[PDB]
Ligand binder design. Sequence first.
Ligand SMILES: Nc1ncnc2c1ncn2[C@@H]1O[C@H](COP(=O)(O)OP(=O)(O)O)[C@@H](O)[C@H]1O
Ligand SMILES: Nc1ncnc2c1ncn2[C@@H]1O[C@H](COP(=O)(O)OP(=O)(O)O)[C@@H](O)[C@H]1O
Ligand SMILES: Nc1ncnc2c1ncn2[C@@H]1O[C@H](COP(=O)(O)OP(=O)(O)O)[C@@H](O)[C@H]1O
Ligand SMILES: Nc1ncnc2c1ncn2[C@@H]1O[C@H](COP(=O)(O)OP(=O)(O)O)[C@@H](O)[C@H]1O
Ligand SMILES: Nc1ncnc2c1ncn2[C@@H]1O[C@H](COP(=O)(O)OP(=O)(O)O)[C@@H](O)[C@H]1O
Ligand SMILES: [Mg+2]
Ligand SMILES: [Mg+2]
Ligand SMILES: [Mg+2]
Ligand SMILES: [Mg+2]
Ligand SMILES: [Mg+2]
Lengths: 372, 372, 372, 372, 372
Amino acid sequence: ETTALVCDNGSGLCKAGFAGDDAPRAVFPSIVGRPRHQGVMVGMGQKDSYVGDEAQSKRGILTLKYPIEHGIITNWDDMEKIWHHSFYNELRVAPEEHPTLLTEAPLNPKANREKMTQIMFETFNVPAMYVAIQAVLSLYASGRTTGIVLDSGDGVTHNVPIYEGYALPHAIMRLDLAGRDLTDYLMKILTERGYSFVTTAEREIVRDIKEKLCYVALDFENEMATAASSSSLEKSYELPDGQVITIGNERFCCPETLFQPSFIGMESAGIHETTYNSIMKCDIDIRKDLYANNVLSGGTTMYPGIADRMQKEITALAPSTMKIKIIAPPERKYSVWIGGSILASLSTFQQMWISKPEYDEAGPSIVHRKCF
Amino acid sequence: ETTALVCDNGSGLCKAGFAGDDAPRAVFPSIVGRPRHQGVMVGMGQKDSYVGDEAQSKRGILTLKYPIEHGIITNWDDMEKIWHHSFYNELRVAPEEHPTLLTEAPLNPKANREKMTQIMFETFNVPAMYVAIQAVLSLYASGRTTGIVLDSGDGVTHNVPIYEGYALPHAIMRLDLAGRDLTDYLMKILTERGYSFVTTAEREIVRDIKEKLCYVALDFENEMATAASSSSLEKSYELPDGQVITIGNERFCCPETLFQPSFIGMESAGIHETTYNSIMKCDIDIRKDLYANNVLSGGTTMYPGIADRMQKEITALAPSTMKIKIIAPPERKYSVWIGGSILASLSTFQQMWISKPEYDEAGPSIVHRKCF
Amino acid sequence: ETTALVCDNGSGLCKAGFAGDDAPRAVFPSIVGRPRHQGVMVGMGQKDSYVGDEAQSKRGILTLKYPIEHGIITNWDDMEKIWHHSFYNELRVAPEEHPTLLTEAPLNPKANREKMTQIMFETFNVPAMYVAIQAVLSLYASGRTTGIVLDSGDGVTHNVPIYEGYALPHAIMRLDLAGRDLTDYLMKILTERGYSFVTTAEREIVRDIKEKLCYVALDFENEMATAASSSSLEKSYELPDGQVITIGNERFCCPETLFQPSFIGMESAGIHETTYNSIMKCDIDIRKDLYANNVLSGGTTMYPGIADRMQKEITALAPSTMKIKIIAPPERKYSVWIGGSILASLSTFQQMWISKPEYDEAGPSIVHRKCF
Amino acid sequence: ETTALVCDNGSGLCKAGFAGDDAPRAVFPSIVGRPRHQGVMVGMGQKDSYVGDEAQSKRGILTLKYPIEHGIITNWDDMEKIWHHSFYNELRVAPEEHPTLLTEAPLNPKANREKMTQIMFETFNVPAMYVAIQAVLSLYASGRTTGIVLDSGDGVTHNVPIYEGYALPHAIMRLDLAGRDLTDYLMKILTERGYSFVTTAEREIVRDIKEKLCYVALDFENEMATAASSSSLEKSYELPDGQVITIGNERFCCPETLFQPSFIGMESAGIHETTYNSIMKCDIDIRKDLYANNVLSGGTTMYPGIADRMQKEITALAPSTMKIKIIAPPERKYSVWIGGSILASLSTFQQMWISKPEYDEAGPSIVHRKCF
Amino acid sequence: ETTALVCDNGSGLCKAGFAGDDAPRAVFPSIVGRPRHQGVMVGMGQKDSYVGDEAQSKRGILTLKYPIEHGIITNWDDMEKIWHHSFYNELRVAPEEHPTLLTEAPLNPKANREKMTQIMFETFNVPAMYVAIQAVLSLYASGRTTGIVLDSGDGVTHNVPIYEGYALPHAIMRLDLAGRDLTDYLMKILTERGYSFVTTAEREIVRDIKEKLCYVALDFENEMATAASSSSLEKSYELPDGQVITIGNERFCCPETLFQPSFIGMESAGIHETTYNSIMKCDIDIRKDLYANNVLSGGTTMYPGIADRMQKEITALAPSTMKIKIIAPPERKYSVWIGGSILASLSTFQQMWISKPEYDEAGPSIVHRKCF
Ligand SMILES: Nc1ncnc2c1ncn2[C@@H]1O[C@H](COP(=O)(O)OP(=O)(O)O)[C@@H](O)[C@H]1O
Ligand SMILES: Nc1ncnc2c1ncn2[C@@H]1O[C@H](COP(=O)(O)OP(=O)(O)O)[C@@H](O)[C@H]1O
Ligand SMILES: Nc1ncnc2c1ncn2[C@@H]1O[C@H](COP(=O)(O)OP(=O)(O)O)[C@@H](O)[C@H]1O
Ligand SMILES: Nc1ncnc2c1ncn2[C@@H]1O[C@H](COP(=O)(O)OP(=O)(O)O)[C@@H](O)[C@H]1O
Ligand SMILES: Nc1ncnc2c1ncn2[C@@H]1O[C@H](COP(=O)(O)OP(=O)(O)O)[C@@H](O)[C@H]1O
Ligand SMILES: [Mg+2]
Ligand SMILES: [Mg+2]
Ligand SMILES: [Mg+2]
Ligand SMILES: [Mg+2]
Ligand SMILES: [Mg+2]
């Protein structure tokens, strides 16, 4: 009878809210900030740790740590702080009266999911819980039942093909290139113009620059020639202290790492080749149905040139008699949460919750037998 | 008073319909498909088994099984599924109000016919039923009363000679070489050009290739020399994913196994020698009447060179003073069903039905005393 | 008068040497490594491509490519580099004074053998050459004349039955599951414990882990229960940078894909069912003689549980009144080369060489008429 | 002075040996086996043709041909191979120092005997030779001088009456129904239980089944009722690959074709009616002497119910005042050879040999004037 | 034919000389001194700017400015003065007859290198010019071809890993903590004992104190407790005017900022953690070869405790099964110049010079395509 909770815990952003809603109620950056300097004023309240938007607002005197690195939770006390902020401070609910739906990247370690179940059942003891794959939730929110989902967030870029509600786990591809690596490459290539960003708050400044100014070029070499010829692609950004920086080719050399991973010294192929290799790893009779249903999800896929570029590259890779369609909804930054809210409100889902007596009987191993 | 049902249950295609019609109403492939992958999206309909055209439409995520192998039913639950799809889903009738005519290959095991009678009288309980030989039905649909019928389908190729309505059972020849063996041979010889087809859906793709592109050469050695000399016999086929394959001599090296079974390591003789041996096993005075009435039936005899080649080979085998005629009607793919509809509408056939009280009195053994 | 050369060119290892020897002189991995990073120091010799053990020794700065994939040569310049390293750098001989014996997998494309003939007669112009089937060479090295050979290497697992020196080509069954697929599956299941291997040098690291620590369980479910109960099956491996990884059930879940191909999403049956179906595809009177002479060959058949497991599975499949014997010699990793050395030293083989004038007269087609 | 040779050349077994012996030294099946598959292993001697027991031991890779079909030799090179195996390989003698006694069926073609004389005088040139009727040799081995011999072998069943050493050629009956037809009928009716035997080696397996398990029922309809009621007549046979088949009524349906030829679609009467018609075609005063001396010979008369059944059928046919006796010695499988050894050792037979000068003077026609 | 020039222009010292020499001919401080007071004595030679050792000798009446700050040139007229003093006053050569090799820190702005090329080709117009990375020159002077170079000078501390002459640019780390920051930290913490330094000449006095008296403690807490317990670590320095100062823990608290950057309010990690993170950012198989070849270079690495402390810290960070070696040659203060002299004297380097026609054709952008 009670309303479920959907808490998409990504590598860079936590999106929490209620099942059945259209948009997540709480979207906050998943950071924990701790003071690096010394406190000299007595009476003012300086907490030992700042979580979320409070860490971003006071980031000049804080060292910021991300508890999730490349989809895997590395700090567990910090993720306890993140979940405590998400439940009590933002959603303002008690977790013992609401089942909670959680998301997880494919090809993740089993200890991550087991400890997620253990913390969600013993610290904030929920009546029931479930772990879902983020790409299945993206396909749920897209409204279709077939397609290959390219989900690129802050730590993990993964391709999952699903045909008629059936997943093909041997064709699931995972690549550790996402928005944090693009941010770091922007820190590296911003020093070529003389702008130095070294601290963790400057990483957030560079991330804001990347979010507001970067774009994907349709042709990389023609854009390189155009940027070297004329200064028509240069844009100016105002720093928080007041300085104005100007960037030229770095607006499109930063997300080009998504298509040329060798820019950051990785042997892997681009996202278009990863998508094509995931399609040709499937059975032949479904491949056409995977060609016309390329679904984009995640915040890294929000550059304003990426759909046409992926369409052009996959059309160059696929045979010419096939129709290539890239499904890029405008709400695809939150599509994993929207699909989680769709799934948690279904009447056929209520018997697949992992309840507290099943966790008491089986221990933290029921999540490998009731979830994929 | 009620209309009878004719249900030709071949090894590869089930053709069902009403007595008195010209063409069968429901022609669907006799396969049962079961999901091999895992289902991850809930709410939409996932059945445990897909039967017929639905199994062909979703064959990329299914393992397809044929319930009938070489004319003998191996899976009986799958055969019940096939009959249930034929009666309720395709013909949309209740089997308890219609007598049913079924077909069977010659020299078949008795337990096959007994279990067919048992299921057709206890599961879909019909008022009456009958089992007929397919070659007699082919001769019924041809409009003649004498001739030798070469029926080649998906599992069984059989020659049956009938003179003036009198069958000669000692000259009936059965050879286990038909369209599935030709499909498997095409799958084997397609790997010489680098095309690999290993799954059960790829078997259906190769079967479509064989149906669309293969033909019987009039002279095998001259056609092999022509294919080795110039690329005028090469044809291109578009795969379901979009790739284009090209085949040369494999257009005629695949049905040549009908005339040279040693291509697939079989000691038996070709269909022309089987026909000649079945003719020469009969009485001498009828042999001339069997020479001018060679009736072709079944889907395997639909290659566009087989009548001239069969004519040439029998004319080489028979003495030169005899006229050799190959009767190849254009509707011979469905001629067994057409003859079943002709027989089931006859006024002299209505007293040869096996009724339900006779089955109750005699058990599943009346079919050996009322049917040939 | 001159000594012949035997060069087994498999998908993962090249084994070259002289005829009449007991062990191959040069066993090196068949890879070509090319530098991915940039060279900043001049003066030292930095070649454009590294072949063999030199590519393995410097693999941290190289992208490694296999020229042969699933028994089929895909890169021909790289294969020319492999053969040039085999002849001049390892064997240290001139190829124009020695005939060369080559091996090939069954059911291979004809263009592979034709281009092998063209390069072996026009680039390294040998006086004569021959292409042999690897399973025939394995039966030559076993010393027997009858038996079914399961040869599993790096790309191809094939069963070939030979009775009294007569092969049955219709019962030859080829399956594209071998040690590279097991290495990829070990990559996929090593991420469950948090170990990430993505690069091509990490493929060699995972392959060394598989070669050193994996084994075939006699009973998979009992070993699953034993590994889940106690940590007595866990083994530790030291990585090249000093980290120690620990693996438990992955020691026997990796070669279990040989018996359950559905672990990597393949519709095919296991190697035991492949062997049983190859035996039952033969004639009846030889089947008992194929039951007691199961010959194992190749490096993939070197797991220390595979003979007992294959014995148990085939004894479960075969009727109980036949004796099942699995012939697993300790030198079966090199048995194809040993059989090639036995064959090339035979006095009755010297008239079966494909000489250079026959190649000049017939062109790239004599290898289909003088070899099987 | 030299020892003569007796070589009974039946349609299914060649029995050769020396005159004056009690049992033939060499009994081997008269088949020629030729390899149907390809040879891949060079070094071992693979002969082009296998004759006799070597063809039976390696029959899984051979096509087997019988040189004699229905008493008449069709392949003469194969009979040269059979005689060369009989003289040099089995008897281990040279034919040029031994006269040879040969047997032939009654009512045979004259060119068969002429070519037998031509081959026995020009290829294996003997000092002398003779052709005798097999039934006269059976009467010689029985020790009597009067009686009617029913000789049924592998191709020909013939009744010959002889009274006081005087043959009656007008009452000699030849019927083309023997053990090969019974083997073919058993091969046909074994498919009713689902056992398929189509190759030539499977014909030998079915012949072994017929030899080991078949019997003649005293009453056919009572045995039908007994087999249909209870499974007390069912017997199990082990196939060479280990499968166990079970046969019921087919143990007595197969030799019932000897009494009801219409089971294989043949217009002729049974062996009992043939014997009665041969007796009634003779003079009346000898008929009683033919009633009490029915001599059985040949391997087809070795069923363990045939003497009582034949006695019952003739006693039903003959008048009740005549005594009916069926002489069935236990050595009647070899009785033709035993009678040939008795005849060739006689002192009064040495003047009836056809010598080489008589053959040179008269040409291939002396055998029609010196033999019956 | 003419001798090239090697001019290492560091942030605090300019080392110029000829190629092929073992030691640089001219080592002078890169400062420009301008008179802050007024001139009253006419006739005395008073220049407007003093460069090099003349600025150091008269620093009591001069304000000293460094043209290079943190590896980036800020004053270009002063840089021209430094180069003019380096060529005409110290080396006493004409730059138009000698090619010049220059050094630059990694991750530097492109405009710095472009203006370096422009001044090098238009003000002191050289026949040819090259710009090289200083860590590659340190590895050149070490005599090895693999290793990770930690170069710490006056403005920039950078780690560059090189394996077999191949650099890994994604693992190159740059940290803006060097000897000028340590001089400022000692300048700050010398006020705790009552010694006040505020001016630019007093900065040179503090730099001399740091060069002569500071050292790196192996254990910081134990040395702090030892200095607090007994005054055995105190040392006395004589000021230029005559006063004697005494320092205690400041001998090891000043270079401890190299290992604890938070002493100067910097969020970055120490040089040992920077070295470890640069090693683990490389590929796995080279990491061992980077562990045993830690090459120290630059004047900041000349403290007499830094090799053992770096060895201890990296051994604490690395896994315990590996050998850690710190290569600290005694000539590592000038190792960049020695490597530049080695590189410029190589015969394989003479085609990598950027000549004057290439600069005239391409403009000041050829230095990004011919240099790294
Ligand atoms: N407008 C934008 N353009 C490009 N990148 C964006 C934009 N908005 C967000 N991002 C990137 O998306 C990443 C997070 O996306 P999302 O998947 O929603 O969060 P998470 O990865 O934590 O689940 C951030 O690292 C950010 O850099
Ligand atoms: N046009 C065609 N050319 C060649 N083969 C065909 C053609 N149409 C059908 N076939 C073959 O006929 C086989 C089945 O024929 P049919 O006798 O109608 O069905 P069944 O054997 O099930 O009774 C199929 O295996 C198919 O490969
Ligand atoms: N001791 C071992 N245990 C298990 N697998 C092994 C072992 N040694 C080698 N292999 C596997 O054998 C494969 C190659 O074997 P082999 O057949 O000799 O080479 P190729 O396939 O090139 O002919 C490699 O992929 C390797 O993974
Ligand atoms: N014990 C037996 N029971 C039934 N049939 C037998 C038996 N022994 C031999 N036969 C049959 O007798 C036939 C040959 O008998 P025989 O006359 O000895 O040889 P041939 O006809 O060649 O002279 C064979 O086909 C065999 O099937
Ligand atoms: N013996 C020493 N002990 C400590 N620091 C030193 C020593 N010698 C030189 N330094 C420091 O090294 C810095 C410059 O070193 P170097 O790298 O040779 O010059 P640059 O940085 O200009 O290339 C100076 O700031 C100086 O303080
Ligand atoms: Mg996400
Ligand atoms: Mg049919
Ligand atoms: Mg191999
Ligand atoms: Mg006989
Ligand atoms: Mg320096």
